[PDB]
Design a protein around this ligand. Structure first.
Ligand SMILES: CCCCCCCCCCCCCCCCCC(=O)OC[C@H](COP(=O)([O-])OCC(O)COP(=O)([O-])OC[C@@H](COC(=O)CCCCCCCCCCCCCCCCC)OC(=O)CCCCCCCCCCCCCCCCC)OC(=O)CCCCCCCCCCCCCCCCC
Ligand SMILES: CCCCCCCCCCCCCCCCCC(=O)OC[C@H](COP(=O)([O-])OCC(O)COP(=O)([O-])OC[C@@H](COC(=O)CCCCCCCCCCCCCCCCC)OC(=O)CCCCCCCCCCCCCCCCC)OC(=O)CCCCCCCCCCCCCCCCC
Ligand SMILES: CC(C)=CCC/C(C)=C/CC/C(C)=C/CC/C(C)=C/CC/C(C)=C/CC/C(C)=C/CC/C(C)=C/CC/C(C)=C/CC/C(C)=C/CC1=C(C)C(=O)c2ccccc2C1=O
Ligand SMILES: CC(C)=CCC/C(C)=C\CC/C(C)=C/CC/C(C)=C/CC/C(C)=C/CC/C(C)=C/CC/C(C)=C/CC/C(C)=C/CC/C(C)=C\CC1=C(C)C(=O)c2ccccc2C1=O
Ligand SMILES: CCCCCCCCCCCCCCCC(=O)O[C@H](COC(=O)CCCCCCC[C@@H](C)CCCCCCCCC)COP(=O)(O)O[C@H]1[C@H](O)[C@H](O)[C@H](O)[C@@H](O)[C@@H]1O
Ligand SMILES: CCCCCCCCCCCCCCCC(=O)O[C@H](COC(=O)CCCCCCC[C@@H](C)CCCCCCCCC)COP(=O)(O)O[C@H]1[C@H](O)[C@H](O)[C@H](O)[C@@H](O)[C@@H]1O
Ligand SMILES: CCCCCCCCCCCCCCCC(=O)O[C@H](COC(=O)CCCCCCC[C@@H](C)CCCCCCCCC)COP(=O)(O)O[C@H]1[C@H](O)[C@H](O)[C@H](O)[C@@H](O)[C@@H]1O
Ligand code: HEC
Ligand code: FES
Lengths: 160, 216, 223, 109, 216, 53
């Protein structure tokens, strides 16, 4: 219910409002009207393979660039624009990075246990006629949603 | 900008009329069947009801007659809890369907609910014994209700769909048909034979109920 | 009852005649007339405490009740006699029914809640915001009679759900769902309130992100 | 699969233990699921009375209890007990006396 | 290896017995019921049939009457195309349900299909006017079929399950019930009143059909 | 029909055949009996994301 309402708002309304090709983008994404029978399979593909594949490729490029364009450093005693002062990869950096990975996954597991996230059982199945009062997206899309809310209802009506 | 069409204060409006939905055209042509029957006439179907009312304008009985699989599967229920007294009301089928309070088709006394054009409405080719026009006694006890059926199919839906609407008329007599045979009983004139008026149809006092069977 | 009516009148005369004028007619621009509100309206409103109201604002807030069950019944009987209207449900003994209002079906109650109640309250009966200073309150405090009477009489900016609109069986199912959702423990940890995205994002940013940043500050070296 | 054994060939039928009365006259009901990996054994050949499976080409002799006489299968097809109820309709006179699908570790006991 | 269990040359077998399934205890919590009715007796329900046979065992007709909503709906279908001749027949409810070829409850001549223990099988508390012991008539045309209904509810499903099974007996007379009033007609002895035997039930010649209403 | 009967033969039959853990492997893979309602979603994941990765 919650996430489908979010989809109906953003993906459907925003896409279908775009002037020249809005409805054409909407119908081509949803295979027809909003509740088209292919939306979730398409999003599943995009979300398990396509977008994560691109994210993995770009993270590889990012890490390779950081690796071979030696990491920049703050000004300091022995630190200049033509040197890297720190610790070597093997003894210290590798061990501390692995330990940090362990601690980060521990924090994530602790929060997965102790804190409830997205109780879909509480959030009934999507139905266009049903809705709640919260109707928010995750905090990263919350700024887009807030822009939608705040912008002052300015609509233009060209010739027909 | 604002939407081009808004804010029509004038023309207060009118209350919408009662919706009269049109029947579904060939598109949604599907519709419920009104009843299958032989229908050897212009068409009556397997659904036909009627209300037998009294001289005071109040419903006494409610009959139902309709062919189901070539034979009329009928049923009658008393519309009031005190219509018929503790006894047998003699049912009959009158050719004239006008369930008037009192009428006389011929030149003579106009008995109550006597709109029938004769006695029992027999078949077109049958005018002797008590054909489908005749009917027996249906009993209403102190409870005052009537529901019981028989097998009287000298006619069918085609015969019911005759030139004139028929009716079911309940008088206040039983069904005997000269139970006193000529061997022992005698008539007023001494002849051991029965009365033609009694033999043609169930004759009784003032009619109790009458209802047109023309889908009344 | 005669004495119940008398007690209701005495409580009314020294509680609300300043804003629901004597004769139960409403004081123009201070309170509505109570003719036709019925006993259910009085029970819900006074028991939730909204009615000993000491301000005219966007919404009358809930508060501790100013009357005990007997006085609530007295006021309700007085208002019902004066106006005549919906009556609060009661059990076999005569007390306001609490367990009898728990409908057997909970899936049906939840569907009806989502179609009608969640519209403004929440997925699970937490509160919701409204136009100008109003808000749909959390339902976790309300008891089955209070929920049923809230539906029966739209208290304030809340649609009035008649018995014809929501048969008492449907209202009982909705009450069952409300109580079940309120009393049900959060599976998967501490449900941060009942709102997913906002409490979840705050808890991320405060618990997980401060932990990660503090651990990074511990591991690394300031410079 | 319900197969009608010809009356002339009814004398060649050999029956299994506990399945002698399963057949209703000349009607024999054998599971379609092949005893080897569970493909349907639909290819019924009359005048040979051989139930062949297309997946791996295993023949079961329908005349005898449906025992495999060729191909990977090694266990006979389960025979359903059949009869006629009131009104003469065919009904099962019980359940398979053995698990019917393809074999597995916890079987034959 | 060969499977442990195979092959049985001896014990040729036996033909499977006709299957007799049992009502579901698991799927149904109780016992599934058919017709629904008040059934103010040991229990009859909204389903009651009967077959009226002939003196030679031929099926004269097949009646069926059952209570639905406090009023008994009934219907009779002709068992043969020529069971009834081209005339009228009087149907009466007889207390004795034995649809025998010929029997005599009292000490006297045993009329054909006269197993009734008296005249019309009236109610227990009613023995005067023609109570439910009298049924609707059966008028047969050249077609020879029976299908028609009346409103006879002096007895109900509760009264149907009486001490003895009842029956519907159809003789070959019309429905008159002393249609010759005392004003004009006279009796054999000169009295203007009707005959007690005629008033008690529909009296005619030898009975044509008789069928027990005990779910025959 | 073709691919389904092929799956039934190979996957289901040969998995159930395995002596000590065959039936357990079958139930883990299909989430139940052979026509379990998770088989094709699981294969779709394995085929578009996991094995291609
Ligand atoms: C995916 C996301 C997950 C994270 C993965 C990203 C990690 C990136 C870190 C980079 C580390 C790296 O590549 O180090 C390797 C590094 C290669 O570079 P190098 O050795 O320094 O060579 C000289 C410089 O490369 C010469 O370079 P330079 O310093 O002169 O600067 C030139 C630079 C210019 O800078 C760039 O533009 C670099 C950025 C590249 C752009 C995008 C490419 C990466 C895309 C990744 C996509 C992934 C999906 O160009 C490059 O070097 C490009 C190299 C591309 C490799 C990227 C790897 C990813 O050395 C090794 O190969 C060490 C590992 C040895 C492996 C063998 C071990 C034993 C063999 C056992 C086999 C089987 C055993 C059975 C028996
Ligand atoms: C709402 C609630 C929170 C929203 C935003 C909170 C921002 C807090 C950031 C605090 C970071 C900090 O002080 O770090 C130094 C401090 C000491 O480390 P350090 O070794 O001295 O740092 C290296 C250098 O000193 C270099 O570091 P620094 O000490 O020279 O830099 C100090 C400061 C200098 O910049 C400023 O002075 C910015 C002042 C902004 C004030 C705006 C508020 C006005 C509100 C009025 C309107 C309301 C109506 O730079 C900032 O932190 C820029 C923050 C601007 C965001 C303002 C958001 C509004 O960090 C800590 O020990 C803990 C920091 C944990 C924060 C993690 C996130 C860092 C990501 C961005 C930070 C910038 C890169 C620096 C590395
Ligand atoms: C569009 C827009 C932002 C409009 C304005 C709305 C807004 C954010 C108003 C401010 C909210 C506040 C601070 C209300 C108290 C009244 C008020 C304004 C007092 C004066 C403020 C002032 C100058 C005080 C002196 C010093 C000072 C700045 C104190 C601030 C006090 C506070 C509340 C600090 C922390 C910030 C905070 C929690 C803000 C609310 C925002 C959110 C998104 C909370 C999320 C959240 C919620 C909403 C839950 O229900 C919940 C339930 C169970 C577990 C977790 C959570 C959870 O994390
Ligand atoms: C009910 C249920 C299913 C529960 C399970 C939940 C689930 C589905 C999944 C989570 C389960 C698991 C498997 C959790 C653990 C995840 C995991 C692998 C943790 C490893 C951390 C760990 C155990 C540390 C032990 C302590 C120790 C001795 C550490 C030193 C030795 C180790 C492990 C070193 C690891 C080094 C490491 C993190 C390598 C990552 C490899 C990658 C992807 C990139 C390497 C890399 C890094 C890390 C940079 O920082 C970097 C910065 C700038 C430029 C380039 C790079 C770069 O290339
Ligand atoms: C994945 C998909 C990607 C897209 C690929 C496919 C896209 C194909 C698009 C082209 C297909 C044809 C357009 C059909 C539809 C169409 O577009 O409408 C036309 C519009 O032409 C005009 O006059 C408009 C110009 C006049 C006004 C001047 C306006 C200036 C604006 C545009 C400036 C603002 C731009 C700001 C951009 C902001 C971007 C936001 C991020 C006129 O209607 P018509 O072609 O006859 O179509 C009839 C339906 O209108 C009719 O409702 C229906 O009944 C049918 O009859 C149909 O045939
Ligand atoms: C650091 C990692 C650890 C994470 C925390 C994990 C805590 C685990 C707790 C134990 C296991 C889960 C218990 C689940 C049982 C459970 O859910 O816990 C409720 C409580 O709930 C409350 O009130 C809150 C009580 C205050 C304590 C918890 C506060 C922790 C917050 C601060 C963590 C997030 C960080 C946000 C930072 C904020 C600052 C931002 C600048 C208790 O029942 P109740 O109280 O009655 O709930 C009402 C229904 O009844 C009633 O119908 C319903 O209508 C409601 O009213 C409902 O509240
Ligand atoms: C993704 C999944 C990965 C697997 C993880 C999970 C695996 C868990 C397996 C352990 C669970 C417990 C086993 C249950 C099932 C079980 O395995 O059966 C047992 C068997 O123990 C024995 O005696 C066997 C030894 C005696 C014969 C000697 C045989 C030597 C053979 C093995 C040599 C050939 C090996 C060749 C390998 C070829 C490999 C091919 C590539 C005995 O039956 P029981 O434990 O009582 O279980 C009853 C059911 O038998 C009962 O039908 C049912 O009705 C229930 O009551 C159930 O409880
Ligand atoms: C926004 C429309 C609206 C809908 C629809 C609605 N509510 Fe309400 N509800 C409110 C508002 C506003 C209040 C506060 C009334 C007041 O305080 O006077 C309220 C009050 C309540 C209360 C009282 C809680 C308390 O502790 O005082 C309960 C319980 C409740 N609603 C449940 C329900 C139920 C059950 C339904 C049935 C579908 C429903 N709501 C539908 C808006 C709504
Ligand atoms: S699948 Fe049938 S014989 Fe192998």
């Amino acid at each position: 219910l919650l996430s489908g309402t979010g989809i109906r708002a953003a993906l459907s309304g925003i896409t279908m409002g775009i002037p020249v090709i809005g409805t054409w983008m909407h119908w081509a994404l949803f295979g027809g009207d909003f509740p088209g029978e292919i939306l979730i399979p398409r999003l599943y593909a995009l979300h398990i393979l396509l977008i994560p594949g691109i994210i993995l490729a770009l993270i590889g490029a990012h890490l390779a660039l950081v690796w071979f364009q030696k990491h920049t450093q703050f000004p300091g005693p022995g630190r200049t624009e033509t040197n890297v002062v720190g610790v070597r990869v093997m003894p210290v950096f590798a061990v501390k990075s692995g330990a940090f990975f362990a601690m980060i996954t521990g924090v994530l597991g602790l929060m997965g246990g102790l804190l409830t996230i997205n109780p879909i059982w509480n959030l009934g199945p999507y139905k266009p006629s049903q809705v709640s009062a919260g109707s928010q997206p995750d905090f990263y899309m919350m700024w887009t949603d807030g822009l939608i809310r705040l912008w002052p209802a300015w609509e233009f009506y060209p010739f027909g | 900008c604002s939407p081009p069409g808004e804010t029509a204060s004038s023309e207060p409006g009118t209350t919408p009329a009662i919706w009269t939905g049109s029947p579904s055209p060939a598109a949604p042509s599907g519709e419920d069947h009104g009843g299958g029957h032989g229908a050897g006439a212009a068409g009556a179907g397997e659904t036909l009801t009627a209300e037998l009312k009294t001289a005071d304008g109040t419903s006494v009985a409610t009959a139902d007659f309709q062919f189901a699989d070539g034979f009329a599967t009928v049923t009658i229920e008393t519309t009031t809890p005190g219509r018929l007294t503790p006894g047998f009301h003699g049912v009959h089928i009158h050719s004239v369907g006008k369930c008037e309070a009192n009428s006389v088709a011929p030149t003579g006394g106009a008995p109550g609910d006597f709109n029938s054009a004769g006695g029992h409405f027999q078949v077109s080719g049958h005018s002797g014994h008590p054909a489908s026009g005749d009917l027996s006694s249906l009993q209403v006890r102190a409870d005052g209700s009537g529901k019981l059926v028989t097998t009287t199919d000298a006619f069918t839906a085609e015969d019911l769909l005759d030139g004139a609407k028929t009716a079911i008329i309940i008088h206040e007599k039983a069904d005997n048909f000269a139970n006193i045979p000529p061997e022992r009983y005698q008539q007023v004139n001494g002849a051991p034979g029965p009365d033609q008026t009694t033999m043609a149809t169930g004759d009784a006092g003032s009619r109790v109920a009458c209802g047109v069977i023309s889908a009344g | 009852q005669s004495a119940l009516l008398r007690t209701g009148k005495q409580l009314f005369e020294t509680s609300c005649v300043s804003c629901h004028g004597a004769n139960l007619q409403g004081v123009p621009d201070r309170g509505p007339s109570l003719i036709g509100t019925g006993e259910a309206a009085v029970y819900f409103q006074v028991s939730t405490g909204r009615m000993p109201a000491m301000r005219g604002e966007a919404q009358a807030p809930s508060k501790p009740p100013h009357f005990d069950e007997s006085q609530i019944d007295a006021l309700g009987a007085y208002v019902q006699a004066n106006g005549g209207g919906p009556t609060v449900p009661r059990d076999d003994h005569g007390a306001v029914a609490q367990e009898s209002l728990i409908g057997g079906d909970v899936a049906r109650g939840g569907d009806l809640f989502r179609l009608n109640c969640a519209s403004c309250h929440n997925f699970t009966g937490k509160g919701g915001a409204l136009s100008s200073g109003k808000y749909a309150p959390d339902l976790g405090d309300a008891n089955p009679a209070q929920i049923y009477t809230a539906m029966l009489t739209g208290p304030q900016n809340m649609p009035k759900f008649s018995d014809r609109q929501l048969t008492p069986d449907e209202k009982r199912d909705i009450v069952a769902y409300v109580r079940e959702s309120a009393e049900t423990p959060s599976y998967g940890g501490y449900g941060l309130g009942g709102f997913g995205p906002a409490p979840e994002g705050m808890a991320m940013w405060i618990i997980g992100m401060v932990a990660a940043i503090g651990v990074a500050m511990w591991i690394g070296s300031r410079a | 699969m319900l197969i009608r054994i010809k009356p002339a060939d009814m004398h060649r039928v050999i029956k299994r233990k506990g399945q002698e009365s399963f057949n209703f006259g000349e009607l024999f009901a054998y599971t379609k699921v092949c005893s080897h990996l569970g493909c349907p054994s639909s290819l019924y050949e009359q005048q040979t009375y051989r139930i062949l499976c297309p997946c791996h080409q295993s023949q079961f002799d329908a005349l005898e209890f449906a025992k495999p006489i060729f191909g990977p299968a090694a266990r006979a097809l389960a025979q359903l007990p059949i009869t006629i109820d009131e009104d003469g309709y065919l009904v099962a006179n019980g359940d398979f006396v053995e698990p019917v699908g393809p074999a597995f570790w916890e079987r034959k006991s």
